[PDB]
Every structure is written in structure tokens, then in C-alpha cells.
């Protein structure tokens, strides 16, 4: 009856706020803790916070970079991570603690939220856009980050070329198009190539 | 303290004198700033306190005004000076709607093209259609996507090039995104363009899918 | 120089913290502010903070959801945004404010970082895996967000099917594999198709596998 | 408090008694917890305070111990039981390395396949080579990629299925991802498997890169 939120992709050195919302029980009267499990590794305790936020404890390795907070009015828990790094890539669980036999045991748990720390890089997928005066083009489609360099005929084609500015898609990936005005006669006799270079992915492509 | 800007759109030619005016509902004394933002770049400060010019600002830019009415003037408009301009209430930090300054030109009708989805892309499982407007003035244009008889928006992402130095025209790329299954279900595809130079709508289409 | 960070995708109803780091000037002496511009729209002032944080000002619209802070020892200022909405999709600039003629003006600006509030959805790209026991498969690739459900022959084929767990790629998109062990003889006489369903994008792709 | 778990990996068959032990560097009295995590699921508390069973837990699970040594015993291991287990020091909330429990069976050699990149993917500009191990025990196996008799390092992804209920075998998929330019530059592509059931390493290859 604990649902987690805030997971996603973070740049190395970035910041992220994870959240855990409670249902079906009194969040205000119960203690809470945070546990993480790196991919293919064992569970590691991160932090614990009292029901009244009176007592708060953290892991030594996560010193100075992680902060835990909670608002009992909203029945919500929070983990604020700063100066994030690759070693912090893991699934984070929020769990309810209960004091039995003068010891603390975790009886409720959350499904988990995934936090991965790395620089996003996707190579472009180039697709042709072929139809007296004619127009043809290339579509760079999905890539990340932005900078993409498009040339035609290894730089031979000049003014007819109009490379449109990149637009961010619902995929979270940038997409641009490059068009060129050419003779209709050339369609049969000449081949037009588009050289798309995306340095982040170290990719150089020639199409058509 | 409501800030109004005039004109909303201005078209000028190099060597002309350009005047933008910003009116305040109530007197703001000389607490009025002018900024310049070029397309896809961060704003730049031109004038502060209505008449004082920032370092690095060409002297052709001039500021005047007191009370409610203020004016920004570019004496010899240059290709560098064509950009979007704003007025901000310095004390309240309220920005104005802004004025876009583009090169003046005779109305030119767009050259419309419709490019079908590539066979390479169709194998992947996604199909994207492109409609191209190549050289038109003014910038304002209406692009409509209709698949078979009718299609609505929500699948389209548009991109406009910045005005060309040599021809002073704009080009627009509208891309319609579809799934392979959805694309193959429908046969006809089309895009309709409307623009001052176009007396009647220009619609170009292809039939496969 | 003003260097910004923290921009990216935010799930609707999410939270994001922006950062602006200062160089080349006395960050502790100067006032700072935040400004935003929505896509294809005009500039909008968001918040201002004093050099010592004595005076903090917000826009009335986003006063309870946005918080401004600064750490002059780090030469950095921050904006914490919560309950983010589509209207908050914008490029957020950090700029220094200087008092001249008893008024404030922004002379130094940051390049800006884009904050776009939306749920990421891409959809799968299905590619065939072409081969007396033979192995066939399909490769669901570059799909976001999970889950994806793979069936073979519209649910007829359940023997030998091993759908592997998804792996997150450097693109930030998941990739899974589905294989099936079949008689080698049937490859000539029978058709095998891989049915991929991705409800987040509501995309249904059917790809036939045939020997290479 | 430093705690150690043994065995790190254990294999049992349904109907067996399974014994797992957690050791503490110093005496911790009864401040020890036991949890179990099934693949792709949240951890579950089984024993709290060393000996107390959590509500909803099968009685076959049993906890014992005081001081440094503690034991978790499953009297009648069942298919649901087979999972990963952890011991946490209750006072310090420090977890142990963990113990893996899987179904015991005879060693089976993997059946290796290698799938060339589809031309459809190459049209997009990406090349993916897949090597498929299938129906093999134990889970431990090594997959290496060779192109021109040259080993690859950081361009490989591996994904293992969960143990099958009917035959208690595993399967693994290793994928080599390359740029379209990289794939064309070289000719041969192979994956080499080595596994207990394989007396000699098994290599499958293809050409026409």
C-alpha cells in the first residue's frame, strides 16, 4: 500500500527527488526507511526517518548527498539525492518499519522506482524523402542530444539545401529534416546523398 | 501595471527607421527596459532606465520616453538587428508581449511537396509523412493534414526555418507520425496549405498504404 | 558566465530542481532572477532573489509551487518546481540583475535549459531474427515505457517461446527479445509471425520471420 | 556490525530441507531479520527478531539463533520458495550479501544460435547481432563476441530468463550492437560459449557482414 515516484534518467552529477505515497494505513504514526538494490546486486539500506521526523539516519557512503523528508499531512515520504553518480544506479524501495522486540523490521514495501545515472546518447536513424523543379530530403528522426550536422553530396550542394531546426518528439528524442531543391532532370541521372554526423554517438552516415 | 506593445508585427528593410512603442497603463517614470532576443538564443539587454544604453549596443538603437509612453528606435536597421524585441517594467519585472521584426518582402506563395513514408522506415514499424513549404512570405501559414477524407491534429510536429538572407523567404516542415498498422489501414494521404499568396488552398496527396 | 543545468523531461505532476552556476563575478553581491519562455510564446518573469536572500519575489501565478534558493558559497542559485504542468513547458533562463538609476535590469543571461512536461512514449521497432530443430525470434527495440507483450501466431504458438526480460539501452529505451524453438522442416511450409503489443503507445506490430 | 551469509548459492529440489545461515561479527542477541525476494519483485519479510514468523508466511519457514550465529530453515521447499534470501541486522538495518536458491537438476549444455542483423534494421542505420543460449544448467555461462578473430568488450548486452517450471532450465540472449558503418567494415561475426555441459567452447559464426 506504498506507491513510489520520481524515478528516471539523471545526468552524472545531477539531482533527483524520489517520492513514496502511502495508502491504507496511518503514515503519520509509522516510521519509514529507504532501501536500494543495484542491478544484479544485493539490497543496501540508505536512510530511515521517524514518524515525526525526530530521528533521521543515513548510510555513511551516501553522506552529504542524500536527504530524507516527509509530510504526514499529505501522507508522503521523500528522498532527495544530489551529486548523483553511476554507483547510485539502482531500484529504490520505500518500506514501513515496525518496532517489535526492541528491534526495527520492515514489513511493508513498495514496488520500486528505477534511477539510472548516465549520459543519454542515441544515434540517428536516417530515412529518405524522395518525391520540372523537384525537392528531395533526409529525415534524421530519433537521436539525442541535439547537435547534428547535415551536408549534401559531401558538401557539393549548397543553397537549395534547407536544414530545418530540430523538434523534440514525444519519444524524448530530437528529430530534424533536411531538404534540397534539384532539377527534375537530375532525378534519373544523378544520385543525391545526405551526410548526417552525430558526434555524441560517433556516427557518420551517408544515405541515397 | 499592464504593459502593452505596438506593433505586434513589423516588417522593415535595411536602411529604414524602425520604431517600437510600449505603453504602461499607469505612470512608471523611467523604469522601462528594452531587450532583444534573436530566434533560438538568450535575450540581450539594449536600454535600461528608458534612455540609457548598454555597452555593446550599436548607437543606432535609441531610447526615449517618460511616464506612460516609451519608444525604441533603430536608425539604420541592419540584418543583425532583425529579431524579437520586448519592453519590461524595471521595478515590477513585467515583460511585454513582444514585437517580431522581419525583412519586408513581396508576398510569395509556398511551393508545396508531400513526401510519402520511406520503405526503409515502414519495415521498422513506424511511418512518418512530411509536407514541405519551401519559399514563401509572409511567414504565417496554415497546414492541415487529412488522411483519406479527414484527419485531425495531435500527430503533427512543425518546424520553420529562419528567414533566408538571400531571398528573405521562410520554409516549413510539417511531419505526420503514424504507426505501421494504422498507416497501412488507410490509403490516401494529403496536406493542405493556406497563405496570403494562395488565393485557394493548395492540397497535394499520394495514394498508397 | 552563467551555467545552467537540471533541464529535461518531467512527468506531469512531477518535480524538478534547476541550477545556475556563476563564474567571473561576485555572486554574493549581485541580485539574481529566473525567467521562462514557453514554446512559441513571449518571455515571462518567474522569480527574483536578493544577494543575501533577504528579499525573495515570485510570480503570483506560481508562488506556492516554485521555490527559489541560493548558495553564495557555491556561487549557485536554484529553482525547485513542484506539481509541474504542461503550462510549465518552457526554457528557463537565469540572469543577473544590476541596480542602475534606482532600477533593476538584467545584463548577464544564461544560455537556458529546456524543461518539457510530458509522459515519454516512443513505441517499439520490431526486427526479425531469421534462422532438426531451428530457432526463430523477433527483436523489440527502442521502446518506452514498459511493458511490452509478445505473442506468436496470435497465441497458437506457446511451446519453446522464451521472452527475455527487457534491458535498458544507452538510449534510455528498453529492449527485449523473444525466441521460439521450432522444427527445421516447418520453415518451408509454415509461417511464423511475432505479435508485439505496446499499450503505452497503443501500438500493435506484427512481423513475419522467415529464414535468412 | 559486519555480517556474512552462507551459502551464497544453493540448489535444492522440491521436498528437501534447505538450510541458510547468517553470521554476525559481534553478538547481536535476537536482532536479526530474514527476507526473500523473488525475481523482479519487492522484498518480503519472513522472520523478524530472529525467531518470529511474519504474518502470512508458510510455517515451513523457521528461524533460530542467538548471539553471532542464526539460521533460516525451510522444511518443505516448494516452487514458490525458490528465491533470493537476505539477512538484515535489525538494529543497524544492514543487509547481508544474500543467498540464491534454485531448482537442482542435471547439467544441460546450451544450444547456441547466432542471428545476423536484419537488413531492415541496417536500413535504419543500426546493426544488432544476437547469440542465443537455450535450455542449459547451471545458470553460469560465458559469452564472448569475436569479429575478425578480435574480441569485443563494451558493446554487448545479456538477458537471462527465469528458471522454467516444467524443465528447470535457463536461457540467455547476448546482443552485439554496432553502427551501420562498423558492421560493414568487417566480414566475420561470431559468438563463443563456454559452459559446464560444453566440454569444448562452442562457436557459431556468419559472414557477409
In 3D, which of B20, B33, B59, B190 has the Cα closest to residue B116? Answer: B190
Q: Domain locations in chain B?
A: 3-103, 112-207
d(CA C124, CA C197): 9
Q: Show the CA angle centred on residue A146, arms to residues A144 and A151, nearest 5°.
A: 110
Distance from CA of B166 to the nearest CA of D (A): 35
Q: What is the CA radius of gyration of chain B?
A: 22
Backbone angles phi, psi at C95, to 5 degrees: -135, 150
Cα dihedral across residues A46, A51, A53, A57: positive or negative: negative
* Interchain contact, A103 vs D91, CB within 8 Å: yes
Encode D67-102 in three state secondary structure: CCEEEEEECCCCCCCCCEEEEEECCCCEECCCEEEE
Widest CA span of chain D, in angstroms?
A: 66
The count of other CB atoms within 10 Å of the CB of residue C14 is 19
Contact B207, B183 (CB under 8 A): no
C36 φψ region: left (φ > 0), alpha (ψ -120 to 50), beta (else): beta
Instruction: Concatenate the DSSP letters of all residues of chain D into one string.
Output: --EEEE-SEEEE-TT--EEEEEEESS--TT-EEEEEE-TTS--EEEEETTTEEPTT--TTEEEEEETTEEEEEESS--TTT-SEEEEEETTTTEE---EEEEE----B----EEEPPPHHHHHHTEEEEEEEEEEEBSS--EEEEESSS-B--SSEEEEEPPPPTTT--EEEEEEEEEEHHHHHH---EEEEEE-TT-SS-EEEEE---
Contacting chains of A (3 CB pairs or more, <8 Å) are: B, C, D
Contact C169, C98 (CB under 8 A): no
* Interchain contact, A139 vs B157, CB within 8 Å: no
A99's grid cell: 518496532
Task: Report chain D residues touching chain A, CB-CB < 8 A.
Answer: 30-31, 33, 35, 37, 42-45, 48-49, 52, 54, 86, 88, 90-91, 93-98, 124-126, 179-181
Contacts of C121 in chain A (CB under 8 A): 170-171
In 3D, which of C139, C120, C150 has the Cα closest to residue C8? Answer: C120
Q: Which residue of A has its CA nearest to C83?
A: A6
Q: Side-chain half-sphere of B79: how many Cα atoms within 13 Å? A: 7
Q: Show the CA angle centred on residue C183, arms to residues C180 and C185, nearest 5°.
A: 135
Contacts of B125 in chain D (CB under 8 A): none
Interface mutation vs chain C, best among A5, A90, A170, most C CBs within 10 Å: A170
Q: In a 10 Å sphere around its CB, with 0-12 CB exposed, 13-18 middle and 19+ buried, how is residue C5 labelled?
A: middle
Interface mutation vs chain A, best among C170, C198, C202, most A CBs within 10 Å: C170
B208's grid cell: 498508397
Distance from CA of A103 to the nearest CA of D (A): 6
D61's grid cell: 519457514
D197's grid cell: 555441459
B207's grid cell: 495514394
H-helix or E-strand containing B172? Answer: strand B170-179
Distance from CA of A98 to the nearest CA of B (A): 50
| Chain D, window 118-137: residues with a beta carbon less than 8 angstroms from a chain B beta carbon | 120-121, 123-124
Distance from CA of D92 to the nearest CA of A (A): 9
**Which member of B158, B171, B177 has the closest CB to residue A162?**
B171
**Which member of A127, A130, A164 has the closest CB to residue B161?**
A164
Backbone angles phi, psi at A52, to 5 degrees: -100, 10
d(CA D172, CA D112): 10
The count of other CB atoms within 10 Å of the CB of residue A69 is 14
Using DSSP, state whether B165 is helix, strand or coil: coil
Four-point Cα dihedral B102, B103, B106, B111, nearest 10: -70
The domain D113-206 is placed in CATH, from the list 2.40.40.20, 2.60.40.10, 3.40.50.720, 3.40.50.2300, at 2.60.40.10
* Interchain contact, A11 vs C19, CB within 8 Å: no
A112 φψ region: left (φ > 0), alpha (ψ -120 to 50), beta (else): left
Contacts of B157 in chain A (CB under 8 A): 167, 169, 175
d(CA D93, CA C2): 43
Distance from CA of C120 to the nearest CA of A (A): 5
Q: What is the DSSP letter of B185?
A: H
Backbone angles phi, psi at A88, to 5 degrees: -85, 0
Q: What is the DSSP letter of B118?
A: P
H-helix or E-strand containing B133? Answer: strand B126-136
Task: Report chain A residues touching chain C, CB-CB < 8 A.
Answer: 5-6, 8-9, 11, 14-15, 17, 19, 116, 118, 120-122, 142, 144, 168-173
* Interchain contact, A17 vs C19, CB within 8 Å: no
Instruction: Give the Å distances, CA to CA, from A127 to A16, A44, A130, A207, D178.
Output: 36, 46, 10, 8, 18
Beta-bridge mates of residue D174: D131, D158
**Which member of A128, A131, A164 has the closest CB to residue B159?**
A164
Contacts of D128 in chain C (CB under 8 A): 127, 139, 141
Burial B62-94 (b: 16+ CB within 10 A, else e): bbebeeeebbbebeebeeebbbbbbbbbbeebb
> Among all chains, which residue has been given the C-alpha cell 509522459?
C119
d(CA A74, CA B128): 44
Q: Which residues are CB-neighbours of C40 under 8 A, at least 6 positions away? A: none
Q: What is the DSSP letter of B75?
A: S
In 3D, which of B195, B182, B185 has the Cα closest to residue B131? Answer: B195
Q: Which residue of C has its CA nearest to B56?
A: C107
Query: Which CATH architecture describes the domain D3-103?
Result: Sandwich (2.60)
In 3D, which of C112, C114, C117, C107 has the Cα closest to residue C12? Answer: C117
d(CA D161, CA D159): 7
d(CA D25, CA D38): 28
Contact D61, D52 (CB under 8 A): no
Encode chain C in three state secondary structure: CEEEECCEEECCCCCEEEEEEECCCCCCCCEEEEEEECCCCCEEEEEEECCCCCCEEECCCCCCCEEEEEECCCCEEEEEECCCCHHHCEEEEEEEEEEECCEEEEEEECCCEEEEECCCCCCCEEEEECCCEEEEEEEEEEECCCCCEEEEHHHCECCCCEECCCEECCCCCEEEEEEEEEECCHHHHCCEEEEEEECCCCEEEEEEECCC
C117's grid cell: 512536461
Domains of chain A, CATH where assigned:
2-117 (2.60.40.10), 127-207 (2.60.40.10)
> Among all chains, which residue has been given the C-alpha cell 549534401?
A152
**Which member of C14, C17, C170 has the closest CB to residue A15?**
C17
**Which member of C129, C163, C167 has the closest CB to residue D130?**
C129
The resolution in Å comes to 2.6
d(CA B43, CA C107): 9
B107's grid cell: 508576398
Same fold, D3-103 and D113-206: yes
Distance from CA of A121 to the nearest CA of C (A): 5
Interface mutation vs chain C, best among A11, A171, A173, A202, most C CBs within 10 Å: A171
Q: Which CATH superfamily is domain B112-207 in?
A: Immunoglobulins (2.60.40.10)
Answer whether A35 touches D (CB < 8 Å): yes
d(CA D169, CA D161): 9
* Interchain contact, B33 vs C105, CB within 8 Å: yes
Contact D97, D5 (CB under 8 A): yes
Using DSSP, state whether B44 is helix, strand or coil: strand
Contacts of C48 in chain B (CB under 8 A): 93
Residues in chain A: 208
Instruction: Give the Å distances, CA to CA, from B73 to B18, B59, B104.
Output: 6, 10, 17
Contacts of A159 in chain B (CB under 8 A): 166
d(CA B128, CA D172): 35
The count of other CB atoms within 10 Å of the CB of residue D110 is 23
Instruction: Give the Å distances, CA to CA, from B161 to B171, C43, C53, C77.
Output: 5, 21, 42, 35
> Among all chains, which residue has been given the C-alpha cell 527485449?
C176
d(CA D54, CA D44): 9
Encode chain A in three state secondary structure: CEEEECCEEECCCCCEEEEEEECCCCHHHCEEEEEEECCCCCEEEEEEECCCCCCEEECCCCCCCEEEEEECCCCEEEEEECCCCHHHCEEEEEEEEEEECCEEEEEEECCCEEEEECCCCECCCCEEECCCEEEEEEECCCEECCCCEEEEHHHCCCCCCEECCCEECCCCCEECEEEEEEECCHHHHCCCCEEEEEHHHCEEEEEC
Q: What is the CA radius of gyration of chain D?
A: 22
Amino acid at each position: 500500500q506504498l506507491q513510489e515516484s520520481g524515478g528516471g534518467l539523471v545526468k552524472p552529477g545531477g539531482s533527483l527527488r524520489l517520492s513514496c505515497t502511502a495508502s491504507g494505513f496511518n503514515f503519520n504514526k509509522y516510521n519509514m526507511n529507504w532501501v536500494r538494490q543495484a542491478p544484479g546486486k544485493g539490497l543496501e539500506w540508505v536512510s530511515s526517518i521517524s514518524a515525526l521526523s525526530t530521528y533521521i539516519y543515513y548510510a555513511d557512503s551516501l553522506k552529504g548527498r542524500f536527504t530524507v523528508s516527509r509530510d504526514n499531512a499529505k501522507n508522503s515520504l521523500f528522498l532527495q539525492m544530489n551529486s548523483l553518480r553511476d554507483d547510485d544506479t539502482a531500484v529504490y524501495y520505500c518500506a514501513r518499519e515496525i518496532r517489535r522486540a526492541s528491534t526495527w523490521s520492515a514489513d511493508l514495501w513498495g514496488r520500486g522506482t528505477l534511477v539510472t545515472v548516465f549520459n543519454q546518447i542515441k544515434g540517428p536513424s536516417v530515412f529518405p524523402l524522395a518525391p520540372g523543379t523537384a525537392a528531395l530530403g533526409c529525415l534524421v528522426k530519433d537521436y539525442f542530444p541535439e547537435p547534428v550536422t547535415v551536408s549534401w553530396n559531401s558538401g557539393a550542394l549548397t543553397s537549395g539545401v534547407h536544414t530545418f531546426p530540430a523538434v523534440l518528439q514525444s519519444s524524448g528524442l530530437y528529430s530534424l529534416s533536411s531538404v534540397v531543391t534539384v532539377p527534375s532532370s537530375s532525378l534519373g541521372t544523378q544520385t543525391y546523398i545526405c551526410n548526417v554526423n552525430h558526434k555524441p554517438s560517433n556516427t557518420k552516415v551517408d544515405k541515397r | 501595471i499592464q504593459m502593452t506593445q505596438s506593433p505586434s508585427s513589423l516588417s522593415a528593410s535595411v536602411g529604414d527607421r524602425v520604431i517600437i512603442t510600449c505603453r504602461a497603463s499607469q505612470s512608471i517614470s523611467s523604469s522601462l527596459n528594452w531587450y532583444q532576443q534573436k530566434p533560438g538564443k538568450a535575450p540581450k539587454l539594449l536600454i535600461y532606465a528608458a534612455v540609457n544604453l548598454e555597452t555593446g549596443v550599436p548607437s543606432r538603437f535609441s531610447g526615449s520616453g517618460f511616464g506612460t509612453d516609451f519608444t525604441l528606435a533603430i536608425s539604420n536597421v541592419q540584418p543583425e538587428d532583425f529579431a524579437t524585441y520586448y519592453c519590461q517594467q524595471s521595478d515590477t519585472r513585467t515583460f511585454g508581449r513582444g514585437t517580431k521584426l522581419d525583412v519586408k518582402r513581396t508576398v510569395a506563395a509556398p511551393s508545396v511537396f508531400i513526401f510519402p513514408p520511406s520503405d526503409e522506415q515502414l519495415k521498422s514499424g513506424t511511418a512518418s509523412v512530411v509536407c514541405l513549404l519551401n519559399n514563401f512570405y509572409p511567414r504565417e501559414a496554415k497546414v492541415q493534414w487529412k488522411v483519406d477524407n479527414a484527419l485531425q491534429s495531435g500527430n503533427s510536429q512543425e518546424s520553420v526555418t529562419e528567414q533566408d538572407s538571400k531571398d528573405s523567404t521562410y520554409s516549413l516542415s510539417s511531419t505526420l507520425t503514424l504507426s505501421k498498422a494504422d498507416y497501412e489501414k488507410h490509403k490516401v494521404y494529403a496536406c493542405e496549405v493556406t497563405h496570403q499568396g494562395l488565393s485557394s488552398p493548395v492540397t497535394k496527396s499520394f495514394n498508397r498504404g
